[PDB]
């Protein structure tokens, strides 16, 4: 069992420094006087690990195998399908946007199909028909849906990959506007 | 003639072998194999009690780890600018709809035509259930303050969310007087 | 203030190595010629920290206290209830799946109860009754629900911890299929 002992005066720096040619290249240890931070530092790369009082720190992005923890707190890895976490989250989970957007307004009587400005499949929508009220519906895929909307009822179709909205038939309940919840 | 250089330290593989720095007789830091019969390699500040260790299947720091200014905390939380300067747990809670599979009653009473009531939560963009006739729940998802309609059990109810989601008004109903509102938990 | 100074020619390796005969145990420093990467490496464990030009990297999973950042970008910690983050996220937030599954089909007239393939509590469901249309409903817990579904109306019950679906009564609106939004 062996120890290579480095000794300095109280509170004075002590580190191991490597120089290649004329160039300071890396060092490890206690780089400054009156300071107990211990550092492993590449002078050439300017890349550094420091052991500090209440935490350890690297001054650049940090990889774990090929995974990346970025200096902005983002994470990239195969678990996130190779995406950055922020994009994986956006794509995987329903946004708590608490906001809505009009995708069409006008008038769509029985048999009338209209174009809407977003893919309305698996969306929260509200359809205004009679009496200036909003009728909630959540759609699935392209298909035929029914709502007992203000005025009577509306049987409607989502088609064209969510970009078509058609009034199949209604009773006294003609759609004149559609909101969708923001994603 | 120039070669790679090695400072070779020769020692029994099964015994501790490390470089120790002392300032004024005080153990300050060390690097290397700190214990006998243990191949873990450590970079350790005695003064700070802060440590990096290379173990068999992982590397480990014993305190919060900063990447630039971002922080990976010992509880697995992450703070950084990408999360708006929030901790990830809070960014997530604020950004995505909770799969709470739970609900809470926010009003009980009886609100006939023209009657408005105050509810204990902001009912905007919420999953709600209104009980009217026949002891059944009628689902609705609200948008902002506004006028809504549901052909609720009994007939129908035209209602208003107002006062920044804190007011619920029965505009008109046909045999369908609301007496309870549940909200899905956030 | 002291320095153990290591010197080599320009762009030649310089490192400190601990060994026992031909069994290398660990090294610290610039392990390669013409390469400024600085390394702390256990030969025995094959576990390594490297300071590179644009990042620092460990070659295995990285622990922060007891928390783990895995090489796939996943994260485990007490903040995630002891779960891996991917599981915490799946359990905690509603999936933006945009897809549905059939959980039952048949015919369930007044008073008829059926068993369904999934727990239908707090789910987005669509019930097909009359006129080949889907009627949206979002359920809460086991309980009694009402929808003015295509054909007239349907008062239905979710029971048996989400695995029972019962038509309590309907007017001309007999359920014949139920879809549920994928979790």
CATH assignment of the domain containing B5: 6.20.80.10
A73 touching C, CB under 8 A? no
Q: How many CB atoms lie within 10 A of CB B154?
A: 18
* Pair C82, C23 in one domain: no
Nearest to B68 among A10, A71, A148 (CB): A71
Give the CATH number for residue B89.
6.20.70.20
Nearest to A51 among B48, B72, B149 (CB): B48
Residue-range definition of the domain harbouring residue A87:
61-93
* Pair C123, C180 in one domain: yes
Beta strands (DSSP E) in chain C are 2-8, 14-20, 23-30, 38-42, 47-51, 55-58, 61-64, 67-69, 75-76, 100-105, 113-115, 124-128, 134-138, 143-147, 153-159, 164-171, 177-181
Closest Cα partner for C80 from B73, B42, A127, A112?
B73
Tokens 């492993």 appear where? A40
* Pair B119, B178 in one domain: yes
* Pair C106, C181 in one domain: yes
Chain-centroid distance, C-alpha B32 = 38
Beta-carbon separation of B32 and C44 below 8 A: no
Q: How many CB atoms lie within 10 A of CB A78?
A: 15
Chain C (101-140) residues lying within 8 Å, Cβ to Cβ, of chain B: 121-122, 137-140
CA-nearest residue to C17 within chain B is B8
* Pair B85, B114 in one domain: no
Q: CA torsion sign, C113 to C114 to C118 to C124?
A: negative
Check: CB of residue A120 under 8 Å from CB of residue A165.
yes
Chain B (136-175) residues lying within 8 Å, Cβ to Cβ, of chain A: 140-144, 146-151, 156, 158
Q: Which of B42, B72, B96 is the last residue of a domain?
A: B96
Check: CB of residue A74 under 8 Å from CB of residue A83.
no
Question: Which residues in chain A have Cβ-Cβ distances shorter than 8 Å to C69?
Answer: 64, 67, 69, 75
Beta-carbon separation of B137 and C155 below 8 A: no
Give the CATH number for residue C101.
2.60.320.30
Bridge-based pairing state of the strands C14-20 and B5-10: parallel
Angle ∠(A122,A123,A129) on CA atoms, nearest 5: 125
SS3 percent helix, strand, coil of chain A, rounded to 5, is 10, 50, 45
Check: CB of residue C74 under 8 Å from CB of residue C83.
no
Nearest 5°: phi and psi at B154? 110, -35
* Pair C170, C100 in one domain: yes
Q: What is the DSSP letter of B81?
A: G
* Distance of residue C112 Cα from the nearest chain A Cα, in angstroms: 23
* Pair C103, C80 in one domain: no
Question: Which residues in chain A have Cβ-Cβ distances shorter than 8 Å to B18?
Answer: 3-4
C20 touching A, CB under 8 A? no
Angle ∠(B11,B60,A59) on CA atoms, nearest 5: 105
Give the technique used to solve this structure.
X-ray
C51 touching B, CB under 8 A? no
Question: Which residues in chain C have Cβ-Cβ distances shorter than 8 Å to B186?
Answer: none
Cα separation, B43 vs C19, in Å, equals: 18
Q: How many CB atoms lie within 10 A of CB B32?
A: 27
**Resolution as reported, in Å:** 2.0
Question: What are all long-range contacts of A74-77, with beta carbons under 8 Å and residues at least 24 apart?
Answer: A74/B80, A74/B82, A75/B78, A75/C69, A75/C73, A75/C75, A76/C73, A77/C70, A77/C71, A77/C72, A77/C73, A77/C74
Question: Which residues in chain A have Cβ-Cβ distances shorter than 8 Å to B88?
Answer: 73
Question: Which residues in chain A have Cβ-Cβ distances shorter than 8 Å to C4?
Answer: 6, 15-17
Question: Which residues in chain B have Cβ-Cβ distances shorter than 8 Å to A94?
Answer: 96-97
Chains A, B: CB contacts under 8 A, how many? Answer: 204
Beta-carbon separation of A62 and C59 below 8 A: no
Q: How many domains does chain B have?
A: 3
* Pair C43, C113 in one domain: no
Q: Which of B10, B38, B63 is the last residue of a domain?
A: B63
Bridge-based pairing state of the strands B78-79 and B70-72: antiparallel
Q: In what order do the strands lie in the sheet containing C153-159?
A: B103-108, B180-184, B127-131, B137-141, C143-147, C153-159, C164-171, C113-115
* Pair A132, A150 in one domain: yes
Give the SS3 label for residue C90: helix
Q: Which of B96, B114, B137 is the last residue of a domain?
A: B96
* Pair C18, C66 in one domain: no
Question: Which residues in chain B have Cβ-Cβ distances shorter than 8 Å to C28?
Answer: 31-32
Cα separation, A165 vs A169, in Å, equals: 12
Beta-carbon separation of C76 and B73 below 8 A: no
Chain-centroid distance, C-alpha B146 = 31
- Chains near C with 3+ CB pairs less than 8 A apart are A, B
* Pair C118, C159 in one domain: yes
Residue to test with chain B: of C13, C22, C42, C182, most B Cβ within 10 A:
C42
* Pair A73, A21 in one domain: no
Beta strands (DSSP E) in chain A are 2-8, 14-20, 23-30, 38-42, 47-51, 56-58, 61-64, 67-69, 75-76, 100-105, 113-115, 124-128, 134-138, 143-147, 153-159, 164-171, 177-181
């Amino acid at each position: 069992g062996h120890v290579l002992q480095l000794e300095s005066a109280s509170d004075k720096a002590h580190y191991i420094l490597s120089k290649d040619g004329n160039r300071n290249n890396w060092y490890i240890g206690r780089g400054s006087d009156n300071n107990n931070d211990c550092t492993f530092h590449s002078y050439v790369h300017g890349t550094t690990l420091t052991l500090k009082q209440d935490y350890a720190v690297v001054n650049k992005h940090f990889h774990v195998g090929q995974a990346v923890v970025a200096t902005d707190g983002n994470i990239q890895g195969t678990k996130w399908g190779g995406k950055w976490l922020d994009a994986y989250l956006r794509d995987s989970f329903v946004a708590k946007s608490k906001a809505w957007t009009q995708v069409w307004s006008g008038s769509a009587g029985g048999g009338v199909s209209v174009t809407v400005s977003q893919d309305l499949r698996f969306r929260n929508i509200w359809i205004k028909c009679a009496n200036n009220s909003w009728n909630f519906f959540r759609t699935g895929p392209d298909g035929i849906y029914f709502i007992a909307s203000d005025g009577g009822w509306l049987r409607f179709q989502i088609h064209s990959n969510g970009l078509g909205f058609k009034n199949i038939a209604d009773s006294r309940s003609v759609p004149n506007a559609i909101m969708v919840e923001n994603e």
